[PDB]
Each structure stands twice: as C-alpha cells, then as structure tokens.
Structure 1
C-alpha cells in the first residue's frame, strides 16, 4: 500500500476492500493506537510503519483528514490500526468505548497515546472497555480465552520534567496498579517500557518497533492456526456478536 485506507465502511461495518489486502500467513502482528485528538497519534504510528523523520507531510502514511472510523495499513505482515480520536454526552462515550473494546480484542498490543499520562479517565475507559466482550465459542480455530492484550502508554509532546526517571517510574507504578487485576489487558513490568515519553528522534521508534513484537500473545489456543486473512473473520464475528451488543446497551443505560 502507498498510504492508509479506511478499515470500516458505514455503520461500523468492515470494508470489503481490505480482505484482498491480507495474506495467508500466520506471522502477522496487529498494533492499534488510541488517544485524544491533539496527541499526534496518527503521526507517531506512521513511523512505526516505516516513515522517516525527514519525510514530507504528504508522505505520512497516516494523514488524518461517518461517525466512527479506523485506518488500516500493512507493511510486511505488520497490521497497524489507527483509531479515530477519543472524545455528545452518552453517544460520544459509547462510541469511544465501542472502538476501544474492539481494538483491545483484535490487537496484540495497543498504543495509548496522550499528553496526560497518568490520566485516570483514560484508564477508566480502558478498564470498562475490557468488560465489553464477545462470546466466540463456535469460532474455529478455537481462540485463546486467558489471552491478554499488551498496552504501551506513550506520552507525546512532553516537557523535560516528564523525562525525569523518577517521574516515569511514579506514573509507571500507577499504570501497573491500574492493570494488576486486569484479566484481558496486560502491561509490562520492566522500568521505562510501559510509559514512553517523547518531546516531539528516529532511533527511539526503531527500538520501539523492535520491541512491540516480543510480548504478543497468539489469538488461538494452538500456534499458527489463524492467518491474517482469517484474523479479519474474527473481526467480523466480534462486531456481530450479540453478547457484546447487550453489554454495550447496559453501559449506555447506566450512563443515562
């Protein structure tokens, strides 16, 4: 692909144009990115896709220019999902939650990009969205049930004090406490690898891109049972699952 293309069509259905974009290989890695509007999430995810710092703005793969939307892009067998920013009242929160829950289920790791880490509102969204779950029992190959999605928090456009090692560990602790009891979300327990701070530099994204492939857990019970092309059929069965739909209705009901 030359650039990013829309992963969804109207009403949150998956576009039929991306299915021919996938391969019959089980050696794929899916990495999503979520966060508020002005965090630069699309510009940052573009350089784990392969963009250089000197490239022009028109050459960025994720150029952010229909209520919900997700942008898909694939280099090699690396699948990058760029979600629309988080931000009305019930529907603004219900939509954000609907896209976050979907991306925690179909991603190996999700990048949480913000300028507010540690931000309790972000953790609140992440911890309730994880309870929005489908029941894909009849899916074959059978899928992993105890599998945890990795989360990497990234603090963009941060000052020099946000780069203080004492400040990173202080907030990293709060992030490991925020998911110590999580069942399907995980966060690393290595210092300086759960909250990454950037002052807004290519030798960090190259190291981070090498690191996003280690703590990925397979979606299936058996190794290499799902190719990327069948990974999308899991996505289609997630948005249609009725157990997930009922849970989202009871979220919106509790918010009103």
Structure 2
C-alpha cells in the first residue's frame, strides 16, 4: 500500500524544439518537497548527454545505445551536427531532477536555420541567452562543461546572462567540469595556473564558484597540501575512455573520477528558491510560469535592439 508511482526508463522532452513548453512529466511527480535541480551548459561537442546519463542512471560498463540521454552516433560526427535539441528531463529513483540543454552558439543550428528578425545569428544568441537565464533561475546546481581550456568566450557569456535575469535575490551554484582531460592537465603546476586564471576571470561574477566541491578533498592528490593553492575553486576533470616510459597514463581511472563526481553532485546543498516552500508539482508550475514570462520579456528585446 506504499508502492512508488512509476519508474522512468527514458528521458522526455521538457521543451519543444520550437521553444514551446511540454507538460508531460506531471505523472512522474509527487507532492514531496526538498527537490534538487541540475542544469548543464557547454559547447557543441562537450558531452553533456554522456555525463548526465552517467550521473543519473548509467554506468561506464553500459553502452551508448542504452543510455538515458541519446548521444551522438558515428554517422553524425562526420557531418558535424548537433544531437540534443531543446531541453530534456529525467528524474531518478532518489527524487533528483536532471535537466539537459542543447548546444549554444552551435554552427549546426545556424546552418539548419539558414534554409528556413534581422539575422539568424541574433536569434541564436538570444535563444542561448534565454536558456542560460532559465537554467540560472530555477536550477539548484549548474555544471559547465568545456572540451578545451582557455575559451575566453563562455565566461563573458555567463556574466552577460546573469545580468539579464527576470528578477532577497538568489544566485545558483556553479561547477566547472573539464571534459576530455589529458595528462598535462593533471599536474600541480598547471592546476595552480588554472585556479589563478579562473579567480581573475570571475572576480565580480556575484556567483558561488568557490568554497564547495574541492578537488583536493576528493583524495585525487594524496600528497598535495591544501595551502599550496590560494583559493581552490569548484573544478573537476574527466579523462578519456579507459613515450620514453611505458604505461603511466597520467591520470586516475575514469570510473573512479566519474563515481566521485556523481557522489559530490548528489551530496550538494538544496537551498530554497523563493520565500515559500516549493514541491515537485509546484516547482514544475513555477518553471513553466517563469518560462512563459521570460519568453515575452523586455530585457531580451532591449538587448536585441542594440545589435
């Protein structure tokens, strides 16, 4: 007399490809409070679907075909086209809501929009900005994935997006994840440089990007002292799938790192959104309301008129 409602087997489309709300996840929500929301931001081929699938209901021992979130296929990499479009949705058994996101400023979207108000570039930029604001207003934790380092363009985009939010103010947490890492990225000398440049590039970001999710506290570097770094920011690295010196790949096992990241993300804080207690159904309604409100907003139009 206490059986669960139902178990989700595959992700659903929360936002349509034409920027339209899709109310089809109510049957998978209950009247429970204290829910966790995860958002993801990144480039075209960063690997958001793979990381989200591995962190929600998948393990590296599985195959990309049975993953919760559909990943890129062999025939799609050659054409250089995106795979995930719109916004996805999936809830695990632990009552954890996972939200995916389509690529931002991806050339595939522009190419598909060419053969279809002034220029498509402005429309793509506005769409990315709107999705970023939505992810920054109703998500408890946001993870940023970057295929390569020193992009110098995503930080500015995030700073501009945080200033175009709709509305005792609340700032969601952020996580810097570097996908497809190499041995050169697993050295203390480079780690310090990464931390200093990150701190100097987000001096007045007004966000929570430090004091939580410390890499040094994850036992990755057993002998590295915490005082060696001036300020250990919330950063994490992910290596590839599992030469005068044989062996010595230069980084820990991929499974161990993904497991540690999953545990750290699962044990993250869950602060209140507004000055009222929100439930699963209430959270969904709030998300739909803010989505509709941001669609017909004035900040986006004002910013677009300047371009």
TM-score, with structure 1 as normaliser: 0.85
TM-superposed deviation, 1:243: 9.5
Whole-angstrom distance in 1 between the partners of 2:21 and 2:188: 42
Q: How does 1:103-122 map to 2 (within 5 A)?
A: 103-122=135-154
Specify the alignment match of 2:189 in structure 1: 166
Whole-angstrom distance in 1 between the partners of 2:133 and 2:171: 13
Three-state SS of the structure 1 residue aligned to 2:40 is strand
Aligned pair in 2 of structure 1 residues 117, 23: CA closer, same or farther (>3 Å)?
farther
Specify the alignment match of 1:241 in structure 2: 293
Q: Does structure 2 conserve the Cα–Cα contact (< 8 Å) formed by 1:179 and 1:186?
A: no
Is 1:209 the equivalent of 2:231?
no
Structure 2: give runs of 5+ residues left out of the alignment. 1-7, 73-83, 111-120, 216-232, 241-253
TM-superposed deviation, 1:210: 2.4
Is 1:93 the equivalent of 2:125?
yes
Aligned pair in 2 of structure 1 residues 233, 214: CA closer, same or farther (>3 Å)?
same
Q: How many residues align?
A: 242
Specify the alignment match of 1:80 in structure 2: 98
Find the partner of 1:197 among 237, 257, 262.
Answer: 237
Whole-angstrom distance in 2 between the partners of 1:68 and 1:56: 21
Three-state SS of the structure 2 residue aligned to 1:186 is coil
Aligned pair in 2 of structure 1 residues 149, 166: CA closer, same or farther (>3 Å)?
farther
Whole-angstrom distance in 2 between the partners of 1:96 and 1:241: 16
TM-score, with structure 2 as normaliser: 0.72
Specify the alignment match of 1:6 in structure 2: 13
- Compare CA radii of gyration and give the structure with the larger one: 2
Three-state SS of the structure 1 residue aligned to 2:297 is helix
Is 1:18 the equivalent of 2:35?
no
Q: Does structure 1 conserve the Cα–Cα contact (< 8 Å) formed by 2:42 and 2:103?
A: yes
Whole-angstrom distance in 2 between the partners of 1:244 and 1:121: 27
